[PDB]
Every structure is written in structure tokens, then in C-alpha cells.
Design a protein around this ligand. Structure first.
Ligand SMILES: OC[C@H]1O[C@@H](O)[C@H](O)[C@@H](O)[C@@H]1O
Ligand SMILES: OC[C@H]1O[C@@H](O)[C@H](O)[C@@H](O)[C@@H]1O
Lengths: 822, 822
């Protein structure tokens, strides 16, 4: 069952019904202002920080879901309906929602009146613009009144939802019916005090009426679907004083058959210099200069169209760096559009706000943002550069770091815990990926502070040495890295032993002592420790590099000597020194993380894919057999059926969900990459298809969430809801799958001095061409792939055969034609 | 004007329409299990802690408000309606909601079927019981199917509302259609791990069907008012797996004309010893022993009725300590029932959970629980004693204390601030009130630790000396106590100077240095410092006592010399030594707190009510003129119209609301008491009536909130919403108003060595009789009041005239009859 389809030419997903399995959203904005917009106009907007500067209010777990957003009530001769269907739910003759890149169009038609709304955040603007087109599709004149509606949030989302004892008395607004370009409403709660910002909601026409008080607009005992004002046919011109401020304007229109009318609405975030906050000496009236300027830039449809066109050009440019043309339109669709679009979203949102993440406790994750860089560096390297600096600035002198930082202030916090020992290494991963992509070796010289300490700056490279040394100086009795709070797996807390209900394992105090070690961090250290060594060598630090490689060899040696269970890699050693993830236990016999990451590091790789005796092959074979399901690879097997106190949060989840038997998509690409490493491209591509959006669209009724983006987890084989996803959009799954498909499956990956072309995708993709812009040059890579296992590519460049699979970077401005034969 | 009426004989408030200005609630329970229940069945229940053990989910700021609670969908031939009106909102032939003491009855009738529901929490039980009576009021036999409904909360309310990324995968339940006494549903989320508790929702009959998944019961795209299952007329027998667990049973009923049937539903909280949690070896089935037992205790209507009568006898007994019979039934109503009922609620709830306080951040405030004791000690002295010990156990060795403590752990925390210099003295206030009431001097010897520290125990009296000494050693340049973070007024933050938005003035770090002083703490010290001295004198500490009264003398002198502005007392001195609350400033000229408290402490009192030269009189006259309004006395005048950086949070509220010009009811009783001290009983009684429920019932459309309980704040004179209240139920206004009316207006107040009878209520109550049980004896106080200004009483006890107004305590079991002439 499907509820829409992909429109590749328009780079949009077309949702053809309001009746989807779950609200399907799009993200508007790619700079500092963002909007979560569902196919039913639901959601909210915020500036830089979803917790601290949320413009509008949204209710998670509402009944029904997603009943609240940007609505346009249409009163046609007494009949009231909304084109987004919800909240009124009046029968519509036609409905369609198109989610595009940075914009969405939602159209609803009922009884001869069609209303189309274009939603988007213009480039360079901290605002959400709506271009509404009302068309009389009947054969007779029509007169209707349109009521816009948005519910404001009191900036601090957390305060908004919990501190009514105070905030029900602070709501303040200003009303400007006769502004320079039309009518506008100003939400200025706390502007009288510490806030130098306010929100504006206006329309490019002089409104017939307005409303700023929710209770008056909606009416007592009524839901948004039964709003009194629209039903009455006229605004109540309410002026709020506390309680719930809203933005609403009414506009009556008369249209002859076939005639249409445009209306442009703007929801904007404005700021004023402290000395320019007030229009009056008494400091009672807000200075509207920036608001009047904003409304002026979108006073006409022509201005809107120009901005939309600029946005389209912006995306065409971003997507011009990596593209592919093959015989698989689902693959191409993901690689050329959707996976890259999603990587921009994760780069901006981290794991903070979606229709699952509430935009409160989570900011920008240290681990999360570093990994997102992996799939974002080719898009806008200059912004990836700044992000690296912001991230490394929240790192501590000893190498450890804040697990996340507040988006608004860029300062780290422990709101979701601290002491995650896998964090430090991810910084090296990010910098390495960035340097391979840009060749910007100078970034290593950038002065970077520790915990934003003015005057504590040291070269970025020094930060990497702190990260590297942290792991070296924190290994257990087996020579494996100590796990600490937890490694990549947030629920593997071996230093917890909590018996206190309700207290988060993520933040709860941990027990000192013990010998808990992580096999995953060991693999992570081997993989990224090598990159550090390489970076140190290029920097002229020969001894440091030599030393670094010694440690790397020691750790990998430990994995093979103390991290092997027999047919797969061990997961870790608990607080007691006992093995975790061994066949010796009845549950949690094999964990996926080390299997994929150890092989990615090259640990246990043998003669070839046919070497059934190489550890890597045995491990991946165990992964296939024990963790495989038609929906992807489950985290571990069997899932824990009883609380295992020495393991922490993991066993608290019912079997088959999240970290306990759920398909945690984020780690699937590691197995995909591992498979290409051992030379089994066919299997790697297989795993890729099981979890990729375009391939799962045909089972939308099972996946349930957005069919155009990856989700964090799909219920596993042990779950009653097997195959059903949760936590869509914000997940490292996007960055990692893009790395997997673009760099390992399609095989085009940037290295320090050359571009590697190493296809390993199997026989399902026999021929394809990748256009890759790297270091200012364009590489047209034509591939003829037999897909034979173990078969590696041979190259020919500009007519002449070359040695190996690394094409040294050609000078900027050139076009290199690489002919690849696998 | 009115939406119901008081029913004194039944001790209930009868709401005669579902269309009230705002949801009006009642609190069920008085021990460890509590329920918030609106007149539309909205609300939720929790065990001991509203944040960590919430059984059911409730949405604050929902659209519409209060859409969610204990519903019973009646399907009669396809027509579906709910007796609580919401959420279906079907036209009812009859509707009524009676809120009583620890129970409520909601009745709705539609098309021949009347459904009455009795809600209550039985004594000694951790459960909410519903006794439903369905009656066929037609002349023909009828049939219908009733669907019960309750939405579970995942215990941790904070996590429930924000951590969906995790909790949408942990919801777990168990269904038992064929139990020992009927059908039962079990909500056992996280019982699998650290929780030793689960909830049960059962009915005393074998249900036809059930539902545990919200989405299935309600249906996609539907609100609770459009629930699919009830409309279909058949349960879907859903078994939840994550998402949203609910409790619902379908019961088919058949009734002959005039016939009725009872159904008993139970929502219970159960715990099992760790070693008896499971019924199976595999640990997958919860041990239902305690649940079965509970359900058995409420399997019949007879058991419910017996429990209700025990509850009634319980309240009759509690209300037998202080009673009054006068010519004013509104006064009697408040004194005899409602004010005392509310004091029991505030004692249990503090300021944690109401339809305004969200039951998340606020626990049990030090200052709040000490003041609540003032109006609760006569009800259950043993519990008051226990509360004092728990409270003082969260005090630090230097006198200061945790501003509040978590109800479940009784451990302090800084979640809402710390370092409020008025907190310490409230401990003395609470103990003094308890000693005077009980005569239990032994409590002073009770060993109490500091911050719950093992081995730190010292006698409770020492705790009081630490409080007393903290103020003496923390005075500023004028000899007035330093204010610190703030005094009683949480918004007077003189050491804040915050320019950073979002940051709560309550938690933000204050600046060191400065000489900020509080005139309020000065008056508080003079008042309770004297009480401390008396306690010391009784313990034989002439040394300690003598010095103590000297300090009181010094501070008293300081107030008159440095805290007098000319026509009223100064409020404070800011960080730079600048006066606050002076006529020299344009705004915030006079603040109410010091006026009432200074006079209560006897500061500035002269020759009588007409001594125009007395500071106390000048101050009170100023209060009347500048702060008086028909709805009570505003905190200060005029309100601040611009942000005063050096004053903290106070000026951030728009004029007329909360601490900035609002009527903060809590401090009105201080002026009421002050007026009785000065001898102006008529004016004191006037103020009492302006803010008291029974007197404001006639303007319910203006007060908006519950007409039977005090609220924290009523919009003041400068607010466009003047007269409208917010934050009902949970406020110290209840305890202080009871003190004022019972001890100073009516004049019956316990003293250390006797019961003082000092009426001072004015001419509006010419005669009344108070029945007071004190120290085991019953005092029948017959008062003949002239109400003459300044006129105070002369007493005759048991046919023998006496001198003064203090009747020494008669032996227990006695009945003394005191004739009072005023
Ligand atoms: O933290 C609790 C405090 O919050 C402040 O915002 C309010 O003005 C006070 O009335 C309240 O006591
Ligand atoms: O702090 C966020 C973490 O919360 C845990 O409960 C979840 O299992 C993790 O997947 C998540 O990363």
C-alpha cells in the first residue's frame, strides 16, 4: 500500500491523501531558521534553537496527532473547511501535499473553491513564508472569508509547557492592522524584559479583521476543528492579555468563475539592538523597523517566486557535487536527491527536533554532529569547517568532551549524560573526512579552545592528539578501551547497576572502579587511530606518528586476542570482567556493532570473500544468519527478555525495539561497508536495499513513517510490530548510508591525495556513471560492473590505464574521464 | 453570575452546568494517593509524587481545555454520549456535578438513560474508585453498551511528555478478562526493569470486551470526542505494544423501566516485594495478588458505600475541632468546611499539582509547607509533627535550607532556586504554631539531622537556634537582614541583574557582594524571633532568651529608624543601598508585605485605632488607599511599567498580574491580621470578604475559577482582566486566611499556656458561637459582639468572670463555657 509517489523531475514526494499511516513531515530552512511541516500543515518553527527560541506552539502526543499548525479556515457561505484537511476534516474534492527541497505545497479543494499554499523559508531570511492561491473552480461567482491561524509559543518551549503558574500572565501582543504593506500581529512576550526579539505574523493586504487571543478565536469547549470565529464568519478582533496569544487575520475575497487571488503571509523572527528596541521614549511600543522591512521583501507574489527560484538554484548547486545515473531509479533517487537532502537536515538539526525528538533536552550531539559531517562535507565544506571548530570547542583538555551543546549558545552541557568514551574518537573521524574532501590541511592549525575557555586555544590538531591519547590512556586489563558511561550504544551502561526507577540511565551517576571494556571503541580506535597517525605524519610529527601506530597495532592485536568469541566478535567486558556478547550466554549472544566496525577497521580480513576461515567472514556470516530480517539487521540476538542489571538500559526495552533487538539502522551501514571490504558487494547492496526509503515505499503501510527519509529504528523480528519504524528524519543513518552507497557501494571516495574509485555493489547495478566534483575538478566516472564477488576495479584515465584505484587529484577546472572496469 | 451553589448540609458544591468559565476541580485522597478531578471527569491520579509516580496522563493547555480524563462512553442504539458532557459534547437532558469532601459525583442523562458516577479515593487505599449507577428513566426497557476509558501515563510525567524517542517503545500491558471479581487491565510499563509497581484498571463484572491501545480505541485522525470503538459499538480487544496504553472495558447493560444497575470500577496502584514480582519463572507475567485483593475489596456496591461512609465519618471528625455558628452563612460555610478542606489539600499537595501547577518541577517548598502548617495543625497534629521533622531534616547546619524537597524521597533540591533568606525563620513559625496547638514540647527534643545526614542529628530546638542565628549574623548596613536570592516575594531578586533571556530569575546565579536588605525579613524576625525567645525561656535558657529578645529589639529599632518611608514601611534596600518601596520613586511606591507583617509583629502600633500618629495606622491607611480594590489588595503600587534590572523578576510581569500589581492573596491575610491588632475589626473583616470564595461566588463569571477555594492571584487594578483569578487551590492563602478568620477575626487562638478569645471582626457579625476543641477539652465560646472600633473582649468562664482574654487550658475531657462580651 502506498500513499503517494516520488516525482524525481520535480525533486518532490507527492502525498495523495491526508490519510497517511502517520504525519509525514518536511523540514523548511537550511541556515538558522527552521520549520517542521507535516503534510497536514502541522508543526512549528524556531530560530537556531528549538528549545530556547521556538516561535510557535506544537503539541506532541495530541489526540488526534498533529492537530495544530498553520491553518487557513475557509468560510464559504457558512461552510467552514481547511485545505490541509485537519483540523476541520471536511470532505475535500481534491487534496495533495508535495514535499520538496526547502518548500512544500499543500492543496485542498471543496465545493468550487481550491486553495493552494506554498510553504518555505527563504534563503537569508529568518521567516516562514506562505503564498496562498485561492481559485474559483465553479461556474458561478464565489465569496469567501479566509482566516489564517498560528499559535505562538512563549519562546522557551520547556517553560511554555510546564510553567503556567507564571507564563499564563505574561503573554503580550501588538496589533498593526494598517501597516506599510498590509496587516500584522506582533508576539512580544518578555520583550518588555530580557528578550531583544519578537515574532511577527502578517499578510500582504489590509485585513478585514484579526484575532490574537486563542480562547476567543476557538471558543470555549471547542477544538481547533470547531473554531468559533471562522464559523461565525468574522474576526473578533481580540487583543490578548496573557493566556494564549495567536496570530490570525481575516480576508474576504470575491472571485468570478476561473478567477484566482494570491495572499502572502509571513511568520518572522526579528531582533533589535538593545538601544533600538523601542519606538517610544517610554519603552512601551516595539520598534517595528525590521518587521516592516521583512514584510516589504515579501509584499508581492513576484518576490515570493523569485525567492523560491533562488532556493531551487541553491539546491541544484548543492546536488551538483555528487550524482549518479544507473539502471536503478530507486538507487539514483536516493543518491541524487533524498539522502543528500536528509544529510543537510541532520547537519542542521542533529537529533534535537522532529515529530519524535521534542526539541527540548537534546541540542547538537558531539558524536551525532561529527558523524553527520561524514555525509555532509561534500555539500558545503565551509560550513562543515565551522561545525568542526564549534564541536572541538566543547572538548575538554584531557580529550573527553561534553556529549552535546546548546544550539543557541554553542556551549556544552550534561543534560543527556557525560563520560561516553566513544565521543573523543569521532572528532578525528570528522576532521579526517573533511580533510580528505577539501584538502584544507590548514584547519589543523585553527586555534581552538577547550570548553569555550577564552585564552585556552590550541591548534585543532592538538585537540585530536587529546582525543587519541584519551583512548590510549584509558584501556582495560585486556588492552581494550574502557567503555565508561557507554560507547556508541547509549544503552550499554556497564558502570550503572541502577535499581532506582524513573532515573535516566543516560544521566544517572555511574559507579567508579570496575574493568568494563568496549570492543566497539577498540575497533573505532584502530580505524580512526590510523587516520590520526596519518595526519601526524603529514604534519611532520614522525615520532608521534610512529608511536600512534604502535598503539593502533596493540589495540587491534587485543581485539583478535581478547575480542573474539569464535564465530563473531565479542561486544565487551562487563564491570566484573565477564564477556558481553558471547555464545556462552543465552541472550545477547551476538551484537552487531563490533562486527561491522571491526571489519571496517580491517581486523580479521583474509585472502578474499571465499576465505570462509577469516574472522571477518565468519563474523559477517554470523551477522547474516542471526541478525538478518527482511527489514534490516537487528542490533543483537537473542533480545534480552529480563532486566540485566549489569548491562544498564539495553534490556529495559521490550524485545525487538530500539537497542534491544530493534533494527537500529545507524549501525547497518557499518555491516554494508564491511561487506564491501571483504569483497561481497552483492550482500552489501542487499543490506542497503532492506533499509533504504525508495525500496521500502511499496510497504508504506508497514514502515508507517516517511517513505522518503531514513528512520532511527525499525522494529525487529522479535517485535509484534516487526517492520514498523519510529524516530524518522533525525538519525546518523542518513550520513552513514550516504557514506556507504556513495563511497563504498558505488565506490567513489575522496582520499588525501587522490580520488579512490573502488566499486563493490554486486550484479544488480551492472552499469552506471558517477559525476563527482572533487577539489574543484569534475570526474566523470563510467562504470562497467560484472558484480562478481571479490572482483575489484581496474582504471583507465583520459585514455591511459593507471595503476591501482586511486586517481590523483587533477587541477581545478579540469574534467577527468575515468573508465572503470569491474 | 453563578454556575452552581453550595450545599452546606451535604458539604458539597453543586455545579449545575458543564459550561463553567473554567474547569473546576476537586482533590480526591488525603493520605498517599491523590486524584485531580474536574467537573467533567478531567484530570489524573498519582501515588505520593505527581512527577515520578503518575498513573494516568493529562494534557495541560489542551484544545479544548480539560479534554481527557475518566470517561464512560454510552452507546444507546448507535447514539454515543458521555455523562461528563466532554469529550463528546452531546446534548444532555440533565447534568450535575457535586464536589464533596474527598469524593465527587457527576451525573448526566440523555434519552432515557441516566448515568451517575461517584468518584473517590478510599481511606487506606492507593486507588480511585468509581461507583457507576445507570438508570432507565423511560417507560420502556432499554439496552446499551458502556465503554470505560482512562489513558495511562508512563509513571515519570516529565519523561512521558518529552522522551518519546525512547518511551514510545516501552508501553506494556496485561489483559485479564476472566479475573476473580471481573475483568482487569494491567499497565506495567518498566515493571520489566526497575519498577516494583504497576497499575490496574478493573471492573466488578466480566466485560464483553476490552482495549489497551489508544490509537485503536480512538481511531486515526480522531479526538476523544469521536472515539471509533464506542461509535462502532464493540471493543476491538486491542493489546498494546508501545505507543499509548489505555484502560477500557465494554459492558452490555439491560434495564427494565425505572431499573438501575451498579458497576464498580477501580484504578489502583500496586507494589510487589522484589522477590514476588512475577507469577512465572520466566518473569513475564506480573504477580497479581495485591491487585486481586484490591479488586475484591471493591467488588460490591455495599463495599463502596461502607468506604464512602467511613470517609464521611473521617471528615466529620476532622471538622469537629473548630466550628462556628453565626448570622453569616457565607462565613460559617468557609470556616466550618471549605477553608479547612483546602488546608488539608495544601498540606498534602503543597504547590506541586493543580490545573495550573504541572506536578513536574515543584515539590514541597520549605517556606510553603511551614506556612501550610499554620492552618493545618488543628486538623491532624500528629501529621503536622511528622511534617515538621521531615522539613527540618532538609535544613543545613548553618541555618539555611533547601528551598524545597522531592515528595517521593523527602530529599531537598535546588530545582526552583536556593538561598532565600526568609526560609529559615518559617521553621520557627511552624513549630510555634504546633506547640501552641498541641502543647507537645517534647518535639523540641526530637533528634533531627541536617540534610538527611547520618550522624548529624541534634535536638529540633537546636535547628530553631540555627534559623534564629542565621538572621542575626546576616544583617546589612541598616541592621536589617540581608535578603539573599529573595525573601517571601520570589520575584524580588536584588542580587540578580539578569540580561539573559529564558534563564529563570529563580535559578540563575546571583552576584556576590552588595548590601541588599529586606524589611519584610526584619518584621518576620521580630515576630518569630520573639516566639523563639519564648520557646527558649520555657526550656530554661534565660541566657539564650535574653540575648534573643535583645536582637529582636535591635531589628525592631532598625525597622522604625531605617525602614520607615513616612506614610508606610519601606520594602527593602537594593544591591547598592538604594531604597525600594519609597514615595521618592515613580513606580513601586508602596509594597504590601512589610505593611502587614511589620504591624503583625507589633511594630509601629500606638494608643489605638485612632492614634493617627502611629506608624502602623499610617501604613495601614496607605495600604487601604493605594492598594485597595473591590477584589482585594494588590502587592504594590504603582506597578512597574518597564524592566527594572536591579529588582529581578518582579517587573517582568505586565502590570496587574502576579507579583507586579496583582492581588497575591497570600499576603492579604497579613493586612487583615494587622488591622485586628490595631483594633479596626470592621476593616479587617472587609478585606477578608473581598478575597473569600463564598463571598465571591456571586461574581463567578469574573473570578472564573472555583468558587469554593482560594486562589493564588486575582488580577489587580492595572490589569485589563482585573478580578480574574489564576492558580486556584494550591496557595498559602488557604492556611493564612484560616489563621486570620479563626484566630484573629473570630478571635479564638491557642497560646502556650491558654486559649485566647480576642474577637475583632467588626459590627457585621453581632453574635456567634465558636466550638473549639483544644488540649483535649471542648470550649463553647458564646460571643456577643458590638463591633465597636477598638473595643476588645471581656470574659466570664463557667459563670465566673475572669481578667484578660486568655483562658488557661482546662483538663482533657472538660467542657468550658466562656461568655464573651465585646
Ligand atoms: O518558582 C516559583 C515562583 O515562580 C515565579 O515565576 C512566580 O512569580 C512566583 O509566584 C513563584 O513562587
Ligand atoms: O539520550 C538519548 C538516548 O536515550 C536512550 O533512552 C535511547 O535508548 C537512545 O537511543 C538515545 O540515544
Amino acid at each position: 500500500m502506498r500513499y503517494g509517489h516520488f516525482d524525481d523531475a520535480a525533486r518532490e514526494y507527492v502525498i495523495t491523501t491526508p490519510h497517511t499511516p502517520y504525519p509525514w513531515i518536511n523540514y523548511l530552512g537550511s541556515e538558522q531558521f527552521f520549520s517542521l511541516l507535516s503534510h497536514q500543515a502541522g508543526g512549528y518553527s524556531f530560530y537556531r534553537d528549538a528549545k530556547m527560541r521556538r516561535l510557535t506552539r506544537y503539541r506532541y502526543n495530541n489526540i488526534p496527532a498533529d492537530a495544530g499548525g498553520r491553518y487557513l479556515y475557509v468560510n464559504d457561505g457558512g461552510d467552514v473547511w481547511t485545505p490541509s484537511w485537519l483540523p476541520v476534516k471536511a470532505d475535500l474534492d481534491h487534496f495533495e501535499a508535495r514535499h520538496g527541497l526547502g518548500y512544500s505545497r499543500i492543496t485542498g479543494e471543496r465545493n468550487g473553491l481550491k486553495v493552494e499554499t506554498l510553504f518555505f523559508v527563504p534563503l537569508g531570511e529568518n521567516a516562514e513564508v506562505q503564498k496562498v492561491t485561492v481559485t474559483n473552480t465553479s461556474d458561478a461567482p464565489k465569496t469567501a472569508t479566509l482566516f489564517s491561524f498560528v499559535e505562538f509559543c512563549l519562546w522557551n518551549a520547556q517553560d511554555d509547557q510546564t510553567n503556567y503558574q507564571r507564563n499564563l500572565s505574561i503573554g503580550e501582543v501588538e496589533v498593526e492592522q494598517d501597516g506599510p504593506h498590509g496587516s500584522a500581529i506582533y508576539h512580544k512576550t518578555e520583550y518588555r524584559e530580557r528578550r531583544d526579539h519578537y515574532a511577527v505574523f502578517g499578510v500582504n493586504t489590509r485585513a478585514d479583521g484579526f484575532d490574537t487571543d486563542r480562547d476567543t478565536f476557538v471558543g470555549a469547549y471547542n477544538s481547533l476543528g470547531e473554531a468559533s470565529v471562522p464559523r461565525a464568519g468574522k474576526s473578533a478582533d481580540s487583543v490578548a492579555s496573557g493566556w494564549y496569544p495567536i496570530g490570525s487575520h481575516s480576508v474576504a475575497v470575491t472571485l468570478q468563475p476561473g478567477e484566482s487571488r494570491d495572499l502572502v503571509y509571513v511568520l518572522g523572527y526579528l531582533e533589535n539592538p538593545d538601544e533600538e528596541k523601542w519606538a517610544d521614549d517610554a519603552h512601551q511600543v516595539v520598534n517595528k523597523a525590521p518587521a516592516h522591512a521583512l514584510l516589504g521583501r515579501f509584499a508581492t507574489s513576484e518576490q515570493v517566486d523569485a525567492a523560491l527560484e533562488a532556493l531551487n538554484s541553491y539546491w541544484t548547486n548543492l546536488l551538483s557535487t555528487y550524482s549518479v545515473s544507473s539502471t536503478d531509479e530507486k538507487l539514483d533517487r536516493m543518491v541524487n536527491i533524498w539522502n543528500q537532502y536528509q544529510c543537510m537536515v541532520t547537519f542542521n538539526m542533529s537529533r534535537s527536533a522532529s515529530f519524535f525528538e521534542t526539541g527540548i533536552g537534546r541540542g547538537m550531539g558531539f558524536r551525532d554532529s561529527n558523524q553527520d559531517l561524514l555525509g555532509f562535507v561534500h555539500l558545503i565544506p565551509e560550513r562543515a569547517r565551522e561545525r568542526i571548530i564549534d564541536i572541538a570547542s566543547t572538548q575538554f583538555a584531557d580529550g573527553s568532551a561534553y556529549h552535546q551543546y546548546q544550539p543557541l549558545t554553542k556551549r556544552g552541557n550534561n543534560d543527556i549524560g557525560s563520560g561516553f568514551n566513544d565521543d573523543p574518537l569521532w572528532l578525528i573521524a570528522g576532521v579526517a573526512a573533511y580533510i580528505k574532501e577539501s584538502g584544507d590541511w590548514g584547519i589543523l592549525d585553527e586555534p581552538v579552545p577547550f570548553d569555550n575557555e577564552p585564552g585556552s586555544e590550541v591548534p585543532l590538531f592538538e585537540h585530536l592528539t587529546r582525543s587519541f591519547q584519551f583512548t590510549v590512556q584509558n584501556r582495560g586489563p585486556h588492552g581494550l578501551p574502557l567503555i565508561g558511561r557507554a560507547d556508541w550504544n547509549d544503552c550499554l551502561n556497564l558502570n550503572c547497576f541502577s535499581t532506582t526507577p524513573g532515573e535516566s540511565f543516560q544521566t544517572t551517576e555511574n559507579q567508579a572502579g570496575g574493568v568494563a571494556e568496549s570492543v566497539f571503541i577498540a575497533a573505532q580506535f584502530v580505524l580512526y587511530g590510523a587516520e590520526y597517525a596519518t595526519l601526524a605524519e603529514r604534519r611532520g610529527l614522525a615520532d608521534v606518528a610512529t608511536e600512534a601506530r604502535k598503539y593502533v597495532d596493540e589495540v587491534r592485536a587485543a581485539v583478535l586476542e581478547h575480542g573474539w568469541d569464535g564465530q563473531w566478535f565479542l561486544r565487551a567486558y562487563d564491570y566484573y570482567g565477564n564477556p558481553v556478547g558471547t555464545d556462552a550466554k543465552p541472550e545477547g549472544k551476538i551484537w552487531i556493532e563490533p562486527q561491522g566496525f571491526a571489519v571496517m577497521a580491517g581486523i580479521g580480513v583474509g585472502e578474499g570473500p571465499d576465505d570462509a576461515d577469516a574472522p571477518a567472514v565468519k563474523a559477517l556470516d554470523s551477522v547474516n544468519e542471526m541478525l538478518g530480517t527482511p527489514h534490516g539487521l537487528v542490533l543483537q540476538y537473542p533480545a534480552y527478555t529480563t532486566y540485566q542489571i549489569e548491562l544498564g538500559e539495553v534490556s529495559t526495552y521490550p524485545p525487538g525495539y530500539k537497542e534491544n533487538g530493534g533494527i537500529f539502522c545507524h549501525n547497518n551501514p557499518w555491516v554494508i561497508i564491511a561487506e564491501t571490504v571483504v569483497g561481497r558487494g552483492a550482500q552489501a547492496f542487499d543490506y542497503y536495499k532492506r533499509i533504504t526509503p525508495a525500496y521500502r515505499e511499496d510497504i508504506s503501510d508497514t514502515h508507517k513513517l516517511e517513505p522518503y527519509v531514513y528512520a532511527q529504528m525499525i522494529a525487529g523480528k522479535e517485535a509484534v510490530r516487526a517492520g514498523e519504524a519510529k524516530n524518522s528524519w533525525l538519525t546518523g543513518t542518513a550520513a552513514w548510508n550516504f557514506v556507504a552507497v556513495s563511497q563504498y557501494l558505488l565506490g567513489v571516495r575522496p582520499d588525501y591525495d587522490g580520488l579512490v574509485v573502488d566499486p563493490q555493489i554486486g550484479p544488480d547495478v551492472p552499469s552506471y556513471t558517477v559525476t563527482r566534483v572533487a577539489r574543484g575538478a569534475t570526474y566523470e566516472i563510467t562504470v562497467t560492473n560484472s558484480g562478481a564477488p571479490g572482483a575489484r576495479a581496474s582504471l583507465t584515465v583520459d585514455g591511459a590505464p593507471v595503476d591501482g584505484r586511486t586517481v590523483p587529484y587533477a587541477p581545478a577546472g579540469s574534467t577527468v574521464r575515468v573508465e572503470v572496469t569491474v
